[PDB]
Amino acid sequence: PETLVKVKDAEDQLCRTSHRPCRVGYIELDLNSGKILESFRPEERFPMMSTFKVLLCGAVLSRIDAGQEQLGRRIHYSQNDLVKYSPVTEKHLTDGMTVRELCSAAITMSDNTAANLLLTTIGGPKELTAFLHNMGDHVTRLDRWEPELNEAIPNDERDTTMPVAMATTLRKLLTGELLTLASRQQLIDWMEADKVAGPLLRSALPAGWFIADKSGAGRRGSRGIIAALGPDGKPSRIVVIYTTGSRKKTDERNRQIAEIGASLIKHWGL
Ligand SMILES: [Zn+2]
């Protein structure tokens, strides 16, 4: 009840004077069992923003497992392929990057060109969506490339998920049989090394805890985070938080998410 109070308070603060569709969504799952521990608007849609990049690399790893792709395959590209927010890819115009390096860049640094390059390797947004639907997530959809997929037009379902869908999908990728044990470990390792989510859940994380996460930010107030975390050096729950529609600035939206994190940590229970 305490984390749920905070999530409602967060939404009230962020949306009161938005003058457009505005919401917060949250779900917490038991990692081992998949049991839904608590939720707030679990079945409402939100823009994924860069949180999709985990699902993208899941699709890539599936192809690697199937012998259709190699972690070490090198991809070259041109300066004209670089889109907004390409901190890693723009440093490798000469050398290109391997598929492994691209996934590290997409997940750990939120590199947009790396995501587009990876989308190409699997056949585009439609094939990411196909991969998701084929593993039983018929809600999540990627429709556009970077950066247009961050547009966050109110109530547009393009490039959206639901908290429950994302959380359930994340659980299947990280601990189910969709990927080999080696690939599922690679996926969580990239998330563990996330470099660009400090002001969100990581800001509330106690010493000794494990976190593997991926953040997102888009237009029209959109912000979110997906995570696997737990005490004692191992993840034991999945957390997904999304918001869209607020007119509040970045730092304020960050603070509200970090506050939800602090609550869910304080009130973790056994
Ligand atoms: Zn479907």
UniProtKB/Swiss-Prot annotation:
Presence of keyword Transferase: no
Applied use: This protein is used as a marker in many commonly used cloning vectors, such as pBR322 and the pUC series.
Any Pfam family: Beta-lactamase2
Additional remarks: The beta-lactamase present on pBR322 was cloned from plasmid R1 (R7268). The class A beta-lactamase family has a specific amino-acid numbering system, sometimes called Ambler or ABL numbering and often misspelt as Amber. A multiple sequence alignment was used to derive a consensus sequence and then the consensus was numbered taking into account insertions and deletions. This allows use of identical numbers, e.g. for active site residues, despite differences in protein length. UniProt always uses natural numbering of residues, hence there appear to be differences in numbering between this entry and some papers.
Protein name per Swiss-Prot or TrEMBL: Beta-lactamase TEM
Single GO MF annotation: beta-lactamase activity
Keyword Hydrolase: yes
Residue positions binding substrate: 214-216
Entry's family note: Belongs to the class-A beta-lactamase family.
Known catalytic reactions: a beta-lactam + H2O = a substituted beta-amino acid
Described purpose of this protein according to its UniProt entry: TEM-type are the most prevalent beta-lactamases in enterobacteria; they hydrolyze the beta-lactam bond in susceptible beta-lactam antibiotics, thus conferring resistance to penicillins and cephalosporins. TEM-3 and TEM-4 are capable of hydrolyzing cefotaxime and ceftazidime. TEM-5 is capable of hydrolyzing ceftazidime. TEM-6 is capable of hydrolyzing ceftazidime and aztreonam. TEM-8/CAZ-2, TEM-16/CAZ-7 and TEM-24/CAZ-6 are markedly active against ceftazidime. IRT-4 shows resistance to beta-lactamase inhibitors.
Disulfide pattern: 57-103
Effect of residue 217 to T: In TEM-5 and TEM-24
Matching InterPro entries: Beta-lactam/transpept-like, Beta-lactam_cat, Beta-lactam_class-A, Beta-lactam_class-A_AS
Alphabetic keyword roster: Antibiotic resistance, Disulfide bond, Hydrolase, Plasmid, Signal, Transposable element
Top-level division of the source organism's lineage: Bacteria
Family matches, as PANTHER family: BETA-LACTAMASE, BETA-LACTAMASE-TYPE TRANSPEPTIDASE FOLD CONTAINING PROTEIN
Active site: 50 (acyl-ester intermediate), 148 (proton acceptor)
GO biological-process terms attached to the record: beta-lactam antibiotic catabolic process; response to antibiotic
First-level EC class: hydrolase
Outcome after substituting residue 144 to H: In TEM-6 and TEM-16
Coiled coil ranges: none
Originating gene: bla
Known EC number: 3.5.2.6
